[PDB]
Amino acid sequence: VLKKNPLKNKQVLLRLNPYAKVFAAEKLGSKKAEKTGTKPAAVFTETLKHD
Amino acid sequence: VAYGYPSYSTIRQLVYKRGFGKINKQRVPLSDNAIIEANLGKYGILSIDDLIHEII
Amino acid sequence: PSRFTKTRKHRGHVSAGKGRIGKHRKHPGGRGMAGGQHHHRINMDKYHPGYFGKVGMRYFHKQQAHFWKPVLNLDKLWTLIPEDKRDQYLKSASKETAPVIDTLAAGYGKILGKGRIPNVPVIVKARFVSKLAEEKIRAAGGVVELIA
Amino acid sequence: SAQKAPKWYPSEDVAALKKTRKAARPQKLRASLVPGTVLILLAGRFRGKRVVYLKHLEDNTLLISGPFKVNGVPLRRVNARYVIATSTKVSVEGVNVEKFNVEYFAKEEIKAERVEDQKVVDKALIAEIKKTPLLKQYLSASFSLKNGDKPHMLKF
Amino acid sequence: RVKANAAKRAEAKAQGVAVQLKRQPAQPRESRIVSTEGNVPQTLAPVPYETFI
Amino acid sequence: GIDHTSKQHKRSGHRTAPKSDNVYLKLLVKLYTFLARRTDAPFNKVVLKALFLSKINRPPVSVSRIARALKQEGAANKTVVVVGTVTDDARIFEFPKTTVAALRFTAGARAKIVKAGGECITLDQLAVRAPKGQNTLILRGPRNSREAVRHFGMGPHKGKAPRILSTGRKFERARGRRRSKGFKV
RNA sequence: GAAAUUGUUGAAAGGGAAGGGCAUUUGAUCAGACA
RNA sequence: GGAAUACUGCCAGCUGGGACUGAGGACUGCGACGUAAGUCAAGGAUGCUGGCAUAAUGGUUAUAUGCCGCCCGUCUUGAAACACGGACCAAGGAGUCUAACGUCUAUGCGAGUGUUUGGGUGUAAAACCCAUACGCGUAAUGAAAGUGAACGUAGGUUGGGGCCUCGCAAGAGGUGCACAAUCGACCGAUCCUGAUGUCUUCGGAUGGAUUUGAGUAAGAGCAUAGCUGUUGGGACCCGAAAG
């Protein structure tokens, strides 16, 4: 008879989507990605700085 | 109208906060996964995040 | 009764239900059948097509009941027999003992053929008959006797 | 009769209240309120008095004492929301303050127990006070807004 | 189309399931990588006012 | 405001209970409303509704219409249900024996039903017998046999029943009714 | 023994009409309601 | 060469201040935390304290103040209008009744229905009762003479609610009233055909037709009553100049 909002009710956040439990646990929203090194060809940068 | 390309985040926050079901019309507040499965369960989809999946 | 009448609900309402522009006035049409072939024509054609003009022979001093010939078919015809003596005759279809149905005594002038009596023979005393009527009778073993 | 009687009547049964879920959890005070923080009393009887803060009691009130010998406030209950927590602090490590619970103030002139209890706590404090010059002369003066004071600007 | 669907269906079914015979409308474009190779972006600019009457 | 895609506040135009104030009727309704709610069997839902219909929608079921219905394949041992009065047809001769559950029976109707060895049940008696309504034949009467519906839809070239008190030659048979006066219909 | 309308008495207010609506101060006035 | 930062985006990351709300009334639901026992913020406010119980709090009213507010009624595309009526008050003041009819509804009976012209009777304009007729309905069609409704389970086809059979079910089949579309058959009118016979002109068998009817095809009506609508009436109320 009174609609509780998830997103601010941890009780109703976990009454749907129980993965929220795990989610909070590994934090998952700050997850860092493996930093790679790939570089663009000089073409891409040459035409980017073109006139 | 105004429109565009909803990211997952807003699709979730839409359905979570303001998502409601049509059941014999009636506009039922979702609030329990048991509701979705009762209707959209015939399609798969027994959870709200199952719904959000079939949307995005 | 006036308390269910709608002119009660229209108390206070100024135009009585009759409209502010169109009023309610004496005779916008004329009176009665006025305008029959002029302004009320679109009604009288359809609605009453044929209402105008002349059609057929005149009959001076016609009396009905020269024409009195009430009709009964074999549709019933047995209904003339009282229900009790009726069943006695249905079983025991026979010549030499046959129910005598006087149709003119019943108030009937001619017997028609609406069809399907039982195979009982019946002696039918009538004024007139349809051909098919009287045929169904003899086909079941009865006869028709003309009377006056 | 003058009026027909109703065909139905409300049952004069009183119903039971649905089982509520509100569990009274202990309050958290704002961090500003450290025992031995001088307070400015904003309202009530001693409004304007500057006062010393001892305990956080069980009804959430704040045990304060003037001290009595200084500004005349006794050991007293005061509401946290009606006080300004200042930044000047005296050491109450070594003041008993155990004795004083809610029931200490049950209402039922001055019971001599209070007179002596005031004396032991004030004596404790006033000693700690003289450690820091003017602070007794501070606690005696009342607080007031001078023209130009901007409480939203003011560091207390 | 009908006749195509029968031949699509029979060949499908006697091969197996997986028939798709309803008409889908034009879908969004799928991802792609356009090669720069020997195709180098041509830079164009808006052009000034002229008359030539 | 909204863009209303349907008329607002619109009643269904289906009767809810009957307009009849006959008390026994209201009870007969009370039975089947209860039956219909609890049964799950459709025969009761139909009979609930057919109890509300006006006199115009309860067109009389003749005893001979009842004879012929039972002549269907496998229908002769069913019990025939008529929500409304049943009347007598002198025009049949051999009549079957069956059980007829009706609101009312004109004298002749029950007399003919009975004298063939049959049975006249009021619909509540049928209820106890056939609570799910099992093994029943519902027989509807001639709705459009009514005189009034002759005149419905009058128009040129429509061939329906002019509204005319006295009927004869020189009652609406002349100009517009025949090629030789004016035109034809 | 109503109303229009009139006298006296009391009350209140009035800078080129009067009356009205939401709201509150002020005055007058009326409860209910605590136990 | 290696950082930082901007900028945009994400987090089921933490959190401070202020406002409005507290609908419901045993229980049940989905959960959450904890080994646990229990506990909870999980299908809608409870807890602690103080006051006034006097005149706190409310309603009414007059006034003042802020902001807003043109005369009503009418006819009109448009009225506060330099459009009409209306100084004020009371009382009176306008869609009736009747004859006849349409649709719908309720009721009695039902292939029938209508006691009330009249008679009987009476506790006397009532109530209660009735014999013959009559009215409407149960046959239509044709100007008329006149003829007058089953090839068939009162037909076939396609849909039909309900019921029936098989199946756990999904589903299959069966019968199918009302109703809807279509092709047929019947009765009258119309136009052809013209057998047997004959008081030689009667008689009209038989088979036909882009014809035609307010018909038939296992009756639906009669009577009371109600709203609304029609018409005739002073006919919603007041109004001519005339005759």
Add this chain to the structure above:
RNA sequence: AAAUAUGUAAGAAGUCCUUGUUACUUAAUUGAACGUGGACAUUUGAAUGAAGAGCUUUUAGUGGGCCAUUUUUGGUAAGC
């Protein structure tokens, strides 16, 4: 020869096979129309929506219109 607008179609009343009826049609069971019997129903044949769909009777007021943008006729024009 555009734009806007506009007709029809997007399946079970579908598609296909076998082969009855007929007095119409062809030289011709050739056709034509209506069928019996038979195969195929998970996407039974585009998208979106649907507070469902269909259907009948009966009666009110109305039948002075005026305005804005766009197309536009008469008019120098007009609150024409």
Add this chain to the structure above:
RNA sequence: GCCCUGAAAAUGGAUGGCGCUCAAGCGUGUUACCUAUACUCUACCGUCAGGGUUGAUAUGAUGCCCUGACGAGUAGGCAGG
């Protein structure tokens, strides 16, 4: 482009007023802010809709119950009072 001239009418008068000149004027850009009977949300009234409810030991079965959407209105129609 702005500015001046071109530019004559009758009661006294109108960027709405007062006034405003690196504007309180013209062009443009970025922000915060103000308030509709609209939008989100709650309560309450009614209207419509779909649900549940038989009996007993209670009393409104038209009753009671859960739930959703909706609410402008002349002439006019119906309804409940």
Add this chain to the structure above:
RNA sequence: GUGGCCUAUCGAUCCUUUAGUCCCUCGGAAUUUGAGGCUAGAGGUGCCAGAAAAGUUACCACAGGGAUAACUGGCUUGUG
């Protein structure tokens, strides 16, 4: 080939008058004149869905009209 290549060249009810079958009817029964019906044309309404129709009023009258003229006023400004 069911009039004029196609798109225009036309006419209710009452009445009359032709043509048609030899058909129905004059109602106490017949025959014969005469009359009346049925079906299809013609005779015409051009205000063309179809009245039978001269003026005058400064001697005047009524119901209305700002749905509509004669002055101001308003828009217009060809004209001045």
